[PDB]
Design a protein around this nucleic acid. Structure first.
Lengths: 205, 82, 80, 85
RNA sequence: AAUUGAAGAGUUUGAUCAUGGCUCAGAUUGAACGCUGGCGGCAGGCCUAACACAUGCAAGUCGAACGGUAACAGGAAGAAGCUUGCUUCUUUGCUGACGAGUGGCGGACGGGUGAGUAAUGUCUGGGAAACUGCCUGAUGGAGGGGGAUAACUACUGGAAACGGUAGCUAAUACCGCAUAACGUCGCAAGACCAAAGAGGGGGACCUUCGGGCCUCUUGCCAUCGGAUGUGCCCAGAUGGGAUUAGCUAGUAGGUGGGGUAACGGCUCACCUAGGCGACGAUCCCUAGCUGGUCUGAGAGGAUGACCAGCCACACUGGAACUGAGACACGGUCCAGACUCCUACGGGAGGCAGCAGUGGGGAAUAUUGCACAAUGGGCGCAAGCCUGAUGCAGCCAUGCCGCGUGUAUGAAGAAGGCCUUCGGGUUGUAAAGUACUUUCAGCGGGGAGGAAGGGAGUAAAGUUAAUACCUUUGCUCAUUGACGUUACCCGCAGAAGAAGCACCGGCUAACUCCGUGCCAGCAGCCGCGGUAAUACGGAGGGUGCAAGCGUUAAUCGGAAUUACUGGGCGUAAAGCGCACGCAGGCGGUUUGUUAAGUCAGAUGUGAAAUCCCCGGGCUCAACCUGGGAACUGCAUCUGAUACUGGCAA
C-alpha cells in the first residue's frame, strides 16, 4: 500500500530527480544518476510509445507516492470535473494532505510529510487528520499539533524549505508553524516538465 | 389503513429515516404512496436534522391516515417553526 | 370529447357485429422508417348497418363478448 | 398444526355448517319462486316472491350473500312475473 | 451545472497492396482455483438438486366481549401449635391476575423461492360494468325477546391420533320480533331489510338495597362520501425456430335463461357460420417481467445476483370452506410418492421462514444476541408476540481507506550475480547514527443512535360534579442488543505486519548457468535437434500490491451483421430471363384537411440507481438534500413547409 524500498533507484529509472531524498545535502552526489537503474542500466533503452506514456505515469506516481488504483481514481475524478483533465489531475494530486504538508516545509520529503500526517501530528482547521490523501480545500489552515511541534524533524524541514522555491498558492509561515492553502495551484505554477497529456492518453486507450 | 411512518434507509450504525405515507400492510422499506419528509437522528449540529412537509401531512390526516409515534413526535418537535 | 379511431371494415359476416382494421403509421425503432401497421378489432354494431369495405369511426366501451370491447359511432365513406 | 389454526379450523367448520343451512334455505325459497313461474301462475309466484324477499334481503344483511346478488335475484324474478302477469 | 466523446497490434507473402478470419492489449463478475495474507469501513455470500430433511425458534393477542379458577400472590372467615401474638391448615374468584375454553381481531401481512408461464404475465398509456376489514367525514338509529352450545361434570370407545353418549351455564356467539330511510326491488303504487354491549367515575333520588340514574370514553348497526387495496377490459411494446402454414365447434357472433362483487361463451339452450393466420396464427425450444446492472463515444450488445415494483409457486395432482380479502407457506379435504409411529385396527409429517444438517457441486456463512430503534399484529393502555428488523459471528468475495516506518548514511562494507578479471551491479540498499508511533498490543476516559413510556402536580375542555377521561405545560425516577462502542488520552519500543505475475514480438522489463526436437513452454506468431534474452534455475529488472495470477462468462476492440456504420466485374456475394399480385417508392399546380412532422401546455413516466450542484461520516467507499434526467405515452392548443388523405 506504499512503496517501502530503494528510493533513488526509482529516481534513477526515470532519469530525473523525483525529490525522493530531499533531506540534508544538496544535489544527489551519491546516486549514480542516469547511469544504471539495474545491472543492464548502462544500455540506452530505445523506448517505445507505450514506454514513454507509461514512464510518464510512473514518474508522476513515484513523485507523489500514489499507487495505481488510487491514481486511476484520480484520473476518473479529473476526467469528470469540468475543464482540462491533465490540469485537473495535477490539481487533485496537489490537494493531497501529505503533499501540502511537504510544500509548506513541514516535512523534508513527501514520505516524511506522509508520516507526520499519518502519526496524527497534523490538524486541518483545528481537527486532526490522520489520512495521507485528504483533499485540502482552498482557504484552509493546516498546522502541526502541540505534540510533535518543536520536534527536530519539522524544524530541520523548515530549514530546507528556504532552499526550494516557495509555492505561490500557500501562506507558508514557519513562525507559528501553520499554513493556509489559499487557492488551487495553476498548471503554470508547478514543475513545468511533466507531460500530463501522456497520462491522459495512457488511461484513454 | 394508511400510515405516515418512518422507513430506515441510511447505512449500518447510521440510520437515516424517511417519513413516508404507506399502506400500512406493506413492508417498512417497501411500497409507499408518497414520501413527505425525512428525519436524520444525527445529521450533525448544523441547521436541520429534519424537514417534513406539513401541508401534505395535513392532507393525509384529512384523508384518514394514521401517524406513528415518531412522526407524531417530530410534528411535536417542528411544531409550526420550532 | 371522446377518444375514437377510424378504420375500414375488413369483414362483415357476423350477426350484429363487424371487424375493423386500423392503420397506425409508426416509425421503426432501429431503422427510422415510417411503416404501416394494422390493428384488427372486433367491433359491435346494433342493427349491422355497415357492410364490407366501408370506413367507420369506433369508440371503446365495456366488453360485449370475447374480445369485442369496441362499438361504432359513425359510418362514413361506404363507396363501392 | 399446533397453533391458533386449530381454533380457526373448528370455527370454520362450525360456520360452514351454519352457512350451509341458511344458504340452502335461501336457495329453496328461490326455487319456490321460479318453480312457480314454470307453471303459468301469477299470484302463486307473487306469493312465493313475497315469501322469499325478506329472507334474501336478510341473508344479504347477515353477510353471507353480499347484497348485489340479493338484488339480482329479486330483479330477475320481478322480470319473470311481469313477463307473465 | 446536469452526455469533455471514439487509439490499435500480431499472423496468409520471397516481398507488396487489398480482402478476410483467428488472436492479443481494456472494463466487468453473486465468481472458483493456485500462491500469498496486517488492520479497518461499507456492501455481498447455494448461480447447482423447485433434492431429502434431524433439532430449536419463525403468529399471536385481548378478561375493558363471556362463563370461569388450573396455577401464583394477596383479602375475608374458621380451626390448630398457640411466642395472646406470629405462624400452619381449610371455605370463599373477594382482588391483582390468569392455564384451558367460547368469542373478536390477526394467521391473505411480514419472510422465502423462480419451478411454471412467451402472454389468463410484465411495462407504458387509456378505460367501465365493480368490491373494499382496519382508517376518516356526514346523517341517523342502538327497542324488545328466545333457543342453544363449548368449557364443566358423569360414564364410555380407542395403543395412540382422536372421538361418542347424557346433563349444566354465559356472552359483543346464534336466531327471531319491532323499527326503516336521501338503502334494495319496482315506471310508480307499494313490498322488504340491521344492531351489542363494555369500561372509568359520581351529587341527589329509587333500590328486589346486586345495581338502577347522570356523565364521559369506547364498541355495534344502516346509508352516502373519501382514502387505501384489489378484481376486470383495451391498445402498443416485451425471446428463438417456417427444416412448424394452416389452426379453431363454446370455436366467432346473436337472442334468451342462469352465474359473478362486476362486464364477458363465464355457463347452458337455440339460431347464425363464423373467428384467427404469412403485420407469422398453430406447433416446438427457451424463459419469471420491470426500475435497473455490465460494456459501449454513441447507437447498440449482454443481463436482470443485492435493493425496489408486479406475477407465480409453497412435497406432487386436484378441490373447495371460513373470511373484507385465499381457492390459503408454518389452515381444511381427497389422492399420490417418500419418511416415521403402531397394540397391525389405524395414525403422523411437509425448511422454496431463520440457523442448521445429508447430498449435489469448482463454489457460497452461525443450530448467535435483542426487541433498544424502525415497522407489523393484538390491546383503552400497560404490555405480549415478531428468525421482519437492528446488530453481532465466519469468509480478501468486492469497493474504499490506512499500515509494514522516517531522515541520514560510501568503508560505494561483506556476500550473491556478471566480468573484456580493469571493474560493474545489487546499492543509500543494509549495517551504523538520529527521530516518529498510524494501526495492531496494554491501561484509563467516553459521545450518539432515546424518542417515548411510567408516577405525581397545575391549567383548560367536558360535566350536575372541584370526580373520571382528554390535551397542554412542569417535576421525579428511569428505558441500549450492539458494547471491554465510535472517538479521545497515556504507555513501551521500529518494535507485530509483502507477496504475486512477468521480462522474444505484440508488451513495460536482460544476462549467466543447466538441458539439447528432450525435459518442457505457449493467448497468437511460434521456441527447444550444444554457445536458448521464449524451456528449468540464479542474479538483475518490470508491473501490480494485501493482494496477485489462471480459468469461466459478458461487452469492447469487431466498420467481422455496418440504423448511426460495410459490401456484390475478378476476393464471399446480381435470381438464367421476364410478367406481375400483396409490399415499397412516386412528375407538376391550386384549394381543403392536419394523419405523419413541428411548437407549446397538462397528466403520467414510483422510490432507489446514473449525471450535476451541495451536506455528513477524520477522507474515501458510503449515506444524504435539491435539481436534471427518465430520450416515452396520452390529451388539448396551435403551425402548414415537406410527406400522406380528399377535390380539381
Amino acid at each position: 500500500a506504499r512503496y517501502l524500498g530503494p528510493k533513488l533507484k526509482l529516481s534513477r529509472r526515470e532519469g530525473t530527480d523525483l525529490f525522493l531524498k530531499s533531506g540534508v545535502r544538496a544535489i544527489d552526489t551519491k546516486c549514480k544518476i542516469e547511469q544504471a537503474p539495474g545491472q543492464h542500466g548502462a544500455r540506452k533503452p530505445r523506448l517505445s510509445d507505450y514506454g514513454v506514456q507509461l514512464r510518464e505515469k510512473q514518474k508522476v506516481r513515484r513523485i507523489y507516492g500514489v499507487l495505481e488504483r488510487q491514481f486511476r481514481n484520480y484520473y476518473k475524478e479529473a476526467a469528470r470535473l469540468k475543464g482540462n483533465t491533465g490540469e485537473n489531475l495535477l490539481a487533485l494530486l496537489e490537494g493531497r494532505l501529505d503533499n501540502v504538508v511537504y510544500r509548506m516545509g513541514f516535512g523534508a520529503t513527501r514520505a516524511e510529510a506522509r508520516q507526520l500526517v499519518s502519526h496524527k501530528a497534523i490538524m486541518v482547521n483545528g481537527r486532526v487528520v490522520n489520512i495521507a490523501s485528504y483533499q485540502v480545500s482552498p482557504n484552509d489552515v493546516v498546522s502541526i499539533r502541540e505534540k510533535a511541534k518543536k520536534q527536530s524533524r519539522v524544524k530541520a524541514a523548515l530549514e530546507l524549505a528556504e532552499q526550494r522555491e516557495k509555492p505561490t498558492w500557500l501562506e507558508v509561515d514557519a513562525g507559528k508553524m501553520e499554513g493556509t492553502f489559499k487557492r488551487k495551484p495553476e498548471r503554470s505554477d508547478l514543475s513545468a516538465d511533466i507531460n500530463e497529456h501522456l497520462i491522459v492518453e495512457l488511461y484513454s486507450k | 389503513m394508511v400510515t405516515i411512518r418512518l422507513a430506515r434507509h441510511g447505512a449500518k450504525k447510521r440510520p437515516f429515516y424517511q417519513v413516508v405515507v404507506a399502506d400500512s400492510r406493506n413492508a417498512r422499506n417497501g411500497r409507499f404512496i408518497e414520501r413527505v419528509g425525512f428525519f436524520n437522528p444525527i445529521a450533525s449540529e448544523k441547521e436541520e436534522g429534519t424537514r417534513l412537509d406539513l401541508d401534505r401531512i395535513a392532507h393525509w390526516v384529512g384523508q384518514g391516515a394514521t401517524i406513528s409515534d415518531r412522526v407524531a413526535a417530530l410534528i411535536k418537535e417542528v411544531n409550526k417553526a420550532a | 370529447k371522446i377518444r375514437t379511431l377510424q378504420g375500414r371494415v375488413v369483414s362483415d359476416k357476423m350477426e350484429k357485429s363487424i371487424v375493423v382494421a386500423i392503420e397506425r403509421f409508426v416509425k421503426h425503432p432501429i431503422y427510422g422508417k415510417f411503416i404501416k401497421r394494422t390493428t384488427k378489432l372486433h367491433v359491435h354494431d346494433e342493427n349491422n348497418e355497415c357492410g364490407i369495405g366501408d370506413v367507420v369511426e369506433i369508440r371503446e366501451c365495456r366488453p360485449l363478448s370475447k374480445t369485442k370491447s369496441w362499438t361504432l359511432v359513425r359510418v362514413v365513406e361506404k363507396a363501392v | 398444526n399446533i397453533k391458533s389454526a386449530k381454533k380457526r379450523a373448528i370455527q370454520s367448520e362450525k360456520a360452514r355448517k351454519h352457512n350451509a343451512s341458511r344458504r340452502s334455505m335461501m336457495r329453496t325459497f328461490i326455487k319456490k319462486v321460479y318453480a312457480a313461474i314454470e307453471a303459468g301462475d301469477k299470484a302463486a309466484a307473487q306469493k312465493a316472491f313475497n315469501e322469499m324477499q325478506p329472507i334474501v334481503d336478510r341473508q344479504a344483511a347477515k353477510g353471507l350473500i353480499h347484497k348485489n346478488k340479493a338484488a339480482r335475484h329479486k330483479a330477475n324474478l320481478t322480470a319473470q312475473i311481469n313477463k307473465l302477469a
